[PDB]
Amino acid sequence: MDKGSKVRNLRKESYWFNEIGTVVTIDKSGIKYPALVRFTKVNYSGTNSTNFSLDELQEV
Amino acid sequence: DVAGLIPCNESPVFTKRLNASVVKLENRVKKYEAGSPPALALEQQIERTKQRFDRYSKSGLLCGKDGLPHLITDGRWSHSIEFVIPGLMFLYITGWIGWVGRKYIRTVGGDTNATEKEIIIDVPLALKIMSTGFIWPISAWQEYISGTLLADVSEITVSPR
Amino acid sequence: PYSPIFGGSTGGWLRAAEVEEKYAITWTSPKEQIFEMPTGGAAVMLIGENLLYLARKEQCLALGTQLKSFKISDYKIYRIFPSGEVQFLHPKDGVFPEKVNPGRLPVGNRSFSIGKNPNPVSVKFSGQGTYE
Amino acid sequence: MFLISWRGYWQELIETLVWAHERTPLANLISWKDKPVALSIVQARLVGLAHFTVGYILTYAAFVIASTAGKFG
Amino acid sequence: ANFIKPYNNDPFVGHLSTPVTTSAATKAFLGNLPAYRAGLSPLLRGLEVGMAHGYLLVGPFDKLGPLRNSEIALLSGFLSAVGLITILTLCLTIYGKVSFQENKDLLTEDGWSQFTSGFLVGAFGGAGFAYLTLLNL
Amino acid sequence: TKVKILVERDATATSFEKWAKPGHFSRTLAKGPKTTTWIWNLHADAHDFDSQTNSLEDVSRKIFSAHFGQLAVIFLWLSGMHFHGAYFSNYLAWLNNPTSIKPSAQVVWPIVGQEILNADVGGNFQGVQITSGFFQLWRAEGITSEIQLYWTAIGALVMSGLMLFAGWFHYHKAAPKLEWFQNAESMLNHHLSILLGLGCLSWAGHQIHVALPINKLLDAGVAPQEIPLPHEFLVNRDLIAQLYPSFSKGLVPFFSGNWSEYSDFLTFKGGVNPVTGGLWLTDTAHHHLALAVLFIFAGHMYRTNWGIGHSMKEMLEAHKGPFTGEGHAGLYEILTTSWHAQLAINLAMIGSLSIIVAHHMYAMPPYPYIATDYATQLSLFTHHVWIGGFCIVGGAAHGAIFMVRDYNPAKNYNNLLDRVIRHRDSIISHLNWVSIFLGFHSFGLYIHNDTMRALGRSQDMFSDTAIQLQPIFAQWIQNLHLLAPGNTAPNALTTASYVFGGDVVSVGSKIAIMPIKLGTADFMVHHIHAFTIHVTALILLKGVLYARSSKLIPDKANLGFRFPCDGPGRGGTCQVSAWDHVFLGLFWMYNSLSIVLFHFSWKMQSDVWGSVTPTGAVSHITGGNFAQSAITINGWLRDFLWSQASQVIQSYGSALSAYGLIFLGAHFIWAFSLMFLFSGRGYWQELIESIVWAHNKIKVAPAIQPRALSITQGRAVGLAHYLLGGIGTTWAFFLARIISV
Amino acid sequence: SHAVKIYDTCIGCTQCVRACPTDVLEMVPWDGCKAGQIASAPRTEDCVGCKRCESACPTDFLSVRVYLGGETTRSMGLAY
Numbered sequence A: 001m002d003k004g005s006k007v008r009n010l011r012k013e014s015y016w017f018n019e020i021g022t023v024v025t026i027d028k029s030g031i032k033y034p035a036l037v038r039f040t041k042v043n044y045s046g047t048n049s050t051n052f053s054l055d056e057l058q059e060v
Numbered sequence B: 001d002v003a004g005l006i007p008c009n010e011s012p013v014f015t016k017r018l019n020a021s022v023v024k025l026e027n028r029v030k031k032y033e034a035g036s037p038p039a040l041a042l043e044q045q046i047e048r049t050k051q052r053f054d055r056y057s058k059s060g061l062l063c064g065k066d067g068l069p070h071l072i073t074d075g076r077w078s079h080s081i082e083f084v085i086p087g088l089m090f091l092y093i094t095g096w097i098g099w100v101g102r103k104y105i106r107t108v109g110g111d112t113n114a115t116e117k118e119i120i121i122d123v124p125l126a127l128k129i130m131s132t133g134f135i136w137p138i139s140a141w142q143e144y145i146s147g148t149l150l151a152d153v154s155e156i157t158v159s160p161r
Numbered sequence C: 001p002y003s004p005i006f007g008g009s010t011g012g013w014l015r016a017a018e019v020e021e022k023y024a025i026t027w028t029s030p031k032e033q034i035f036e037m038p039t040g041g042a043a044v045m046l047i048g049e050n051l052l053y054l055a056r057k058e059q060c061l062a063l064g065t066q067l068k069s070f071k072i073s074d075y076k077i078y079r080i081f082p083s084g085e086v087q088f089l090h091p092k093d094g095v096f097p098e099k100v101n102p103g104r105l106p107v108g109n110r111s112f113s114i115g116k117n118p119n120p121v122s123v124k125f126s127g128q129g130t131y132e
Numbered sequence D: 001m002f003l004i005s006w007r008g009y010w011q012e013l014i015e016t017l018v019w020a021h022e023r024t025p026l027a028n029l030i031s032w033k034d035k036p037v038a039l040s041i042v043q044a045r046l047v048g049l050a051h052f053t054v055g056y057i058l059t060y061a062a063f064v065i066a067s068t069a070g071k072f073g
Numbered sequence E: 001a002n003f004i005k006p007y008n009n010d011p012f013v014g015h016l017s018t019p020v021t022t023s024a025a026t027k028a029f030l031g032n033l034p035a036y037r038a039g040l041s042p043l044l045r046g047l048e049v050g051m052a053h054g055y056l057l058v059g060p061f062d063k064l065g066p067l068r069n070s071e072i073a074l075l076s077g078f079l080s081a082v083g084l085i086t087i088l089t090l091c092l093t094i095y096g097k098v099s100f101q102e103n104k105d106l107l108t109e110d111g112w113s114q115f116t117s118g119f120l121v122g123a124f125g126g127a128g129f130a131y132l133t134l135l136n137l
Numbered sequence F: 001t002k003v004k005i006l007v008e009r010d011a012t013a014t015s016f017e018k019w020a021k022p023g024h025f026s027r028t029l030a031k032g033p034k035t036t037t038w039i040w041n042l043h044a045d046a047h048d049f050d051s052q053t054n055s056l057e058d059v060s061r062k063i064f065s066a067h068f069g070q071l072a073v074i075f076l077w078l079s080g081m082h083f084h085g086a087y088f089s090n091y092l093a094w095l096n097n098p099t100s101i102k103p104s105a106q107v108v109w110p111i112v113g114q115e116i117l118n119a120d121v122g123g124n125f126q127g128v129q130i131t132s133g134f135f136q137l138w139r140a141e142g143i144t145s146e147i148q149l150y151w152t153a154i155g156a157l158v159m160s161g162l163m164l165f166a167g168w169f170h171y172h173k174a175a176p177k178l179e180w181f182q183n184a185e186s187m188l189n190h191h192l193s194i195l196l197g198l199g200c201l202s203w204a205g206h207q208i209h210v211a212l213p214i215n216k217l218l219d220a221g222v223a224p225q226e227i228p229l230p231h232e233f234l235v236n237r238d239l240i241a242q243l244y245p246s247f248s249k250g251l252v253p254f255f256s257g258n259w260s261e262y263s264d265f266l267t268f269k270g271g272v273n274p275v276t277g278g279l280w281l282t283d284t285a286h287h288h289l290a291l292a293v294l295f296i297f298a299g300h301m302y303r304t305n306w307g308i309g310h311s312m313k314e315m316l317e318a319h320k321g322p323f324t325g326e327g328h329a330g331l332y333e334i335l336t337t338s339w340h341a342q343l344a345i346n347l348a349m350i351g352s353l354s355i356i357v358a359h360h361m362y363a364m365p366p367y368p369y370i371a372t373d374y375a376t377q378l379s380l381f382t383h384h385v386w387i388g389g390f391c392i393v394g395g396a397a398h399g400a401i402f403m404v405r406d407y408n409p410a411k412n413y414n415n416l417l418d419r420v421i422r423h424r425d426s427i428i429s430h431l432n433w434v435s436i437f438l439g440f441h442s443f444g445l446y447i448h449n450d451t452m453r454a455l456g457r458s459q460d461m462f463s464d465t466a467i468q469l470q471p472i473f474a475q476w477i478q479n480l481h482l483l484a485p486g487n488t489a490p491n492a493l494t495t496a497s498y499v500f501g502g503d504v505v506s507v508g509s510k511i512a513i514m515p516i517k518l519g520t521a522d523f524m525v526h527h528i529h530a531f532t533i534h535v536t537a538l539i540l541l542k543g544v545l546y547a548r549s550s551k552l553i554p555d556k557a558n559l560g561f562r563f564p565c566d567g568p569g570r571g572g573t574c575q576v577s578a579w580d581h582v583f584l585g586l587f588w589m590y591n592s593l594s595i596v597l598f599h600f601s602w603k604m605q606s607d608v609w610g611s612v613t614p615t616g617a618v619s620h621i622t623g624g625n626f627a628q629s630a631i632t633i634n635g636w637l638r639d640f641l642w643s644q645a646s647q648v649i650q651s652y653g654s655a656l657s658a659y660g661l662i663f664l665g666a667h668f669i670w671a672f673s674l675m676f677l678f679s680g681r682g683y684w685q686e687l688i689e690s691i692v693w694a695h696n697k698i699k700v701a702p703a704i705q706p707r708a709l710s711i712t713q714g715r716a717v718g719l720a721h722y723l724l725g726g727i728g729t730t731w732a733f734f735l736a737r738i739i740s741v
Numbered sequence G: 001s002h003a004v005k006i007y008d009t010c011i012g013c014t015q016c017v018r019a020c021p022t023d024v025l026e027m028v029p030w031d032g033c034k035a036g037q038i039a040s041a042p043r044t045e046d047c048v049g050c051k052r053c054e055s056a057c058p059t060d061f062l063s064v065r066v067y068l069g070g071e072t073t074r075s076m077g078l079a080y
């Protein structure tokens, strides 16, 4: 929704499913997955951020 | 009584085992001069064996056909001494431990260096938490009825849930 | 002729190269230097054009990566059949795959997240898996 | 053997075996029709499990039969 | 000097021209074996190979077989050699019928068939000759 | 002066700041733990200096000071051993009556009933019987008192402190520069002429002046109380002249060249001392003196600062023939620019040397009363055999590491390494063929014998009373060694060892050493040994040669030394790294050494060790059942494992019960290792995911996320537990089988 | 041959293309991503199945996926 806002993940395949992550950047220039989110826990690959579509995030 | 077990107080096989242990220790000590350090050690072993067998006889344990004590663990109060009483102690001690641990996890977890505080323990805070475990059952029940014990369904899961 | 100076090794190609596809790699070396063979120990690359033969495309691409990341040399890779046909393989349009090249067309692209694939039961008894 | 050591080692060994066969006089005449490769990972696990099970069952059957029939107990 | 150079002057082939691999001794010795000799009908190649391998095979069965200590050891060894030769000719026939399927060089259906017939005849000849020799020695 | 001392003063600051930052050494681990894998990595890369700094000087300074630390640890271990001998041992009682008194230098506190482990060894003493042969070593040194052991321990402690201080000083205060390390000629001169030359010379002096007279008095029956102190043998020459009437002449014969006058205490009689059952002390004195001379001479071979000497670079460059292109050109740079190459060579040599020590010490017992201590002989042999195998495999592993990391094709053009890499396929194919041939023939001999014995066809087996496979070459060599004294070694009174032939040396009615006859069983077992060694060499050599590339992975070197795989492509690419080759080679080395130890144990129990009667009759431990029972697998299963395992299984209720407990525990750990060896990481990762959900449901969730062990770590743990279980099982088996005596 | 598929979650960082040892993958122009590029697998006959591309993927779950299938000489990593 906005920079720095916490969002609950809804991507079923995501390692951070049902977890809270902070939005880093949002691309207003179209794009299918514009909302970059960062989570505290690192996934199995060691990364802690991913791009999601606004439909795949619960706002708060 | 219980399952055809005769109390170890009147168990001939129990006394035979005691005699065998004592006599074998005596045969072992017969090859040392009286008063030699080995002789004193063996005599102390004999005394400890006699005390162990006497304590078992006086305790009220139930012997089998083999002469060894058997434990009744069906909840019988007369035999709680065998399993119920120690078990409670365990569930207390471990409970304490567990509770304390959980608290530490939930105390240092609200920090940026939460990971760094697990390899390196905050000994002052750690002892602060550890000293509070003697009331772990009450605190656990209070958290349970207060909703602060369990996390909501909104937590990590897998594709098929 | 143009081959890098190499003393020979028992790791070269085998009968399938004669009977099946063989591979060739060409490049240009500004100077003469020693590089590690994908099969043998070491070889000296000639000044100017160097042509080398191998039995697997992976060997050619490993050697190409060595050249690119050590001696900053551009290279080309071809496949030769027993019939004499020669096919150009690695630079498909003169520009490496890492760099975008207008004109390329996507292949094997799915327009949905990986988690939206159909269930195996839906595609059953047809000669297809969920991805296809 | 199949449960501990996995494929890569065996494939690299079969490479040298293929080379040796192809470079032998009086044996180059005879050539395989199917290219010889190491067992697949799943196949190797299955074969190791099969050997484990067969050996287990045979040894225990031998023990249980022989002891009982030898001491009549 | 340098006695190890790439085979066929091709550095990129998986071989080397070592003294064992490419020397007058080995080239002449292998080039005169029936399997590689020039101007031999495949039947003759098979016959030579069979004669070599039949006489060669009676001895192990004769001397190390279960009947080695009996007065009929030699005949049992000969029969075992004959059976093994029959097995090997079966192997050769199936290999020929599987490999070369779609008189000449030995790598053909008819060439290999003639080679196998020659091999059988020569192997039985070698076994019989070994028996004849060992019968009185 | 090309060879010179170069150091950096105050190279590193001494502070505890780093001690509170675990993982500081490596750049990746310094960021702190995100998952538990980090933890494991911190213990795996701790001593991987080469991967922590790109400078060779820094790696060299770390290695030097780590070696100082290891020396400190070894000195502390020696101090502990000597102190437990002085305060907690029956060394004096054993001295008085070595045959009957069982050595023991460990005592257990009575806390849970474990005092049963305090055996009735003797000498009015109770403790755990030791099998380290320390009592025999101390007797050979003429200790004869516990004050000397106490002071030996104190000196060892002071030396450990000095080693620790030297390590600290040579890292943090005066760190030698790289040019200082790269002095192979000077280092070899100093290690040969002084470390090994003057070490031998000093020990020979000790033996001549201390051990010889004291041991001669002890053999004469003098009680240790009446033996004068060792220093008394240095002040009054006559006191030694009574024992060896050649000191009377003094040192004048030595300088005059009349060394023959010293034949009283510098002998070449060989054989074994009939009284103590060990080697003659005079023989060992002459041995060490000759070795000191040779080492001092050899330490002047290399050129350091004065023109005279050998330049190993030129030496290597000079040796090149037609078959090997450039010859040994570039090996000096390899061995002076990479610690992994040097470590590979040194570990291989140390392992082979340890195995040679194990073989030589049993055949010619060097210490008094060690031959008849069957428990000590077996323990020492097996210990040093295991150490040798481990060191050999480690040398292989570090050769592979060098090949992956420190190998540079530019500096290795058409030299020996290049050519070996270029006919690696032929090498491995032929080693594979010879391994298969050896395995087939040798093990099929056993299978054939077993099949024939099961079918009742005993006349068709490979046995002495059947088809015979006599080790004719070994028997011929034994005969030549038997005939050597007087003909090919005219000045040697007796054969080197009684194994080859001769009388039966028995001490106190126990057969210290006797000739060992080789039969068909010896032939078969020796070929089994050769088969296993060839297979282990196959695995390790294949790991070394194919460490950089292969027809599967042309770019294996970029993947590193140890990596799990390269994916399921190309069929499957599991265990393709050289580290995995070491992982398999460790299993095969363990198997081969297990066979070696079983061969030694059964052969010695059935053919050498035993008892003698006053007439001279011999009665061995197992009655010589090796010849007709070591030729079938069932024979090994029944007459060796099942039969000799009675002691362990029946040790409960005695001082050896600890051995039975360790037997079971080793079995348990060995079986436990299979969990890691067979299973894969994905299952455990998913199980941990479920367990983590369970923890999270109660708001218990470690910040350091749990992770299943990496694939490489899974294999390493499985192998470590497998080796521990096997080694412990055989350890308990041998010690309980050879301590019930 | 193995089947290599690229999903629209890709962020066009090129890492999969770089990691590929057999030059199966490449970059093609695209508009659904910020970088304007997407990975493609035009020539999967040369894919060996090492799954290096998947290992070198930043996206939460493997915008590039490899499914092993029929094995040929090329995909079986055989020099013979």
Ligand code: CLA
Pocket (backbone or CB within 6 Å): B097, B098, B099, B100, B101, B102, B104, B121, B126, B127, B129, B130, F691, F694, F695, F698, F700
């Ligand atoms: C304080 C930490 C803590 C707490 C509260 C729990 C609590 C629990 N664990 Mg977990 N667990 C822990 C640590 C902890 N565990 C650790 C360190 C390990 C790794 C060895 C595991 C591995 C583990 C497994 C594999 C399983 C559980 C299970 C369980 C549940 C049943 C009890 C049990 O089986 O214990 C088992 C405990 C162990 C096997 C090891 C415990 C080791 C020590 C005693 C705990 C750590 C104490 C630590 C020093 C805290 C110090 C605090 C101080 C700094 C102030 C329960 C939710 C089970 C479950 O899911 O039930 C539904 C289950 O299957 N646990």
Ligand code: CLA
Pocket (backbone or CB within 6 Å): E061, E065, E066, E075, E076, E079, E080, E082, E083, E084, E086, E087, E090
């Ligand atoms: C299960 C079926 C089976 C049967 C019936 C036999 C039968 C026999 N085996 Mg055994 N064997 C078998 C399986 C079998 N084998 C297997 C599976 C193995 C591998 C583990 C072996 C390994 C084996 C060894 C290692 C040896 C035998 C030997 C023998 C012979 C015992 C010696 C004797 O008295 O004959 C005396 C033998 C002769 C007089 C020679 C006659 C040989 C045959 C019968 C002539 C006809 C063959 C025929 C043309 C072949 C047709 C080919 C094709 C159509 C199938 C006997 C014929 C021994 C032997 O042959 O001694 C040399 C021997 O040393 N066998």
Ligand code: CLA
Pocket (backbone or CB within 6 Å): F076, F077, F079, F080, F081, F083, F084, F088, F106, F107, F108, F109
């Ligand atoms: C180096 C080899 C070695 C070995 C294997 C042993 C082993 C043993 N010794 Mg011997 N000893 C040694 C060297 C050795 N010692 C040396 C060099 C000396 C001379 C000082 C002695 C002097 C000695 C005596 C005088 C006695 C023993 C005894 C013992 C036994 C009991 C030890 C024990 O648990 O007590 C209890 C020990 C402890 C509880 C250890 C303390 C725990 C510390 C505080 C843990 C700290 C770890 C720390 C957190 C790690 C991080 C570092 C930190 C400092 C920063 C045991 C068999 C005793 C024995 O056999 O009784 C019959 C006995 O009386 N030893």
Ligand code: CLA
Pocket (backbone or CB within 6 Å): F267, F268, F269, F270, F271, F279, F280, F283, F284, F286, F287, F288, F290, F291, F294, F360, F361, F364, F365, F366, F494, F495, F496, F497
């Ligand atoms: C010449 C004096 C001498 C004497 C009396 C001994 C005595 C002994 N040695 Mg030693 N040894 C010596 C010299 C000597 N050694 C030298 C010079 C070497 C170097 C190769 C060795 C290497 C050696 C080994 C590796 C072992 C022994 C062992 C033994 C013991 C075995 C029993 C026996 O009868 O030995 C008889 C000894 C022999 C028959 C060996 C004689 C070796 C000759 C002298 C080699 C000479 C090489 C020559 C000088 C080369 C010069 C080249 C140079 C100019 C370039 C015994 C105490 C064994 C032992 O103690 O195990 C417990 C053992 O394993 N010795």
Ligand code: CLA
Pocket (backbone or CB within 6 Å): F043, F044, F045, F046, F047, F048, F049, F343, F347, F390, F391, F392, F393, F394, F395, F397, F398, F401, F561, F562, F579, F582, F586, F720
């Ligand atoms: C001179 C001896 C020597 C030296 C200096 C080294 C040094 C090194 N080795 Mg080499 N190695 C050696 C001997 C040696 N090794 C031997 C004998 C073997 C054969 C097994 C190996 C096999 C080997 C492999 C396969 C590898 C190394 C690696 C390494 C490096 C990292 C080591 C490390 O981090 O330790 C970490 C140490 C530990 C984690 C401690 C574990 C110790 C074992 C597993 C447990 C011991 C159990 C104990 C004895 C008994 C337990 C009793 C039980 C009841 C509790 C380092 C350069 C690694 C590397 O990458 O280097 C580049 C690597 O991959 N080495």
Ligand code: CLA
Pocket (backbone or CB within 6 Å): D001, D004, D005, F432, F435, F436, F437, F438, F439, F440, F443, F444, F447, F535, F538, F539, F584, F587, F588
């Ligand atoms: C007891 C079980 C066992 C057996 C029999 C083998 C057998 C073998 N291993 Mg394996 N291995 C095992 C356990 C075993 N291993 C385990 C537990 C591990 C884990 C560490 C390994 C790891 C391992 C590696 C890493 C390597 C081997 C290698 C070898 C080979 C050595 C060469 C050889 O002897 O060929 C001869 C074959 C035998 C002796 C097997 C017995 C055959 C008998 C004698 C005859 C059988 C009857 C006959 C075939 C009848 C035919 C007819 C019948 C079909 C009806 C051989 C295939 C090496 C290899 O393949 O290269 C040479 C190698 O590199 N193994």
Ligand SMILES: CC1=C(/C=C/C(C)=C/C=C/C(C)=C/C=C/C=C(C)/C=C/C=C(C)/C=C/C2=C(C)CCCC2(C)C)C(C)(C)CCC1
Pocket (backbone or CB within 6 Å): E051, E052, E053, E055, E056, E121, E122, E124, E125, E126, E128, E129
């Ligand atoms: C010298 C030597 C060697 C080798 C050797 C060999 C290898 C040998 C072989 C041998 C052989 C391999 C022989 C063979 C022979 C054969 C024969 C001799 C044959 C004959 C035949 C015949 C006579 C036939 C006849 C017939 C027929 C054809 C058919 C039927 C009818 C008849 C009967 C007429 C070497 C150098 C390594 C080393 C040293 C020694």
Ligand SMILES: CC1=C(/C=C/C(C)=C/C=C/C(C)=C/C=C/C=C(C)/C=C/C=C(C)/C=C/C2=C(C)CCCC2(C)C)C(C)(C)CCC1
Pocket (backbone or CB within 6 Å): F078, F151, F152, F153, F154, F155, F156, F157, F159, F198, F199, F201, F202
């Ligand atoms: C066991 C030990 C110990 C101790 C030890 C000791 C005590 C040792 C000693 C040692 C010694 C005590 C040594 C010495 C040495 C010496 C020497 C080595 C010498 C040499 C000399 C020379 C070489 C000479 C030469 C010459 C002369 C004669 C003069 C003239 C000229 C000339 C120069 C030629 C302790 C307890 C600490 C601990 C543990 C270890």
Ligand SMILES: CC1=C(C/C=C(\C)CCC[C@H](C)CCC[C@H](C)CCCC(C)C)C(=O)c2ccccc2C1=O
Pocket (backbone or CB within 6 Å): F675, F676, F677, F679, F680, F681, F684, F685, F707, F708, F709, F710, F711, F713, F714, F715
């Ligand atoms: C059991 C198992 C696990 C799970 C094992 C784990 C996570 C190890 C757990 C270690 C515990 C937490 C430490 C305590 C262990 C003992 C109580 C004592 C310490 C032992 C040493 C670490 C010193 C794997 O991750 C694995 C991965 C790949 C192949 C096989 C396997 C495998 O077999």
Ligand code: SF4
Pocket (backbone or CB within 6 Å): D006, D041, F564, F565, F566, F567, F568, F569, F572, F573, F574, F575, F711
């Ligand atoms: S099974 Fe494990 S080791 Fe084998 S290819 Fe797959 S990930 Fe790699």
Ligand code: SF4
Pocket (backbone or CB within 6 Å): G006, G010, G011, G012, G013, G014, G015, G016, G017, G038, G039, G053, G056, G057, G058, G059, G062, G063, G064
């Ligand atoms: S590695 Fe993944 S995110 Fe990067 S370009 Fe390839 S498919 Fe896209």
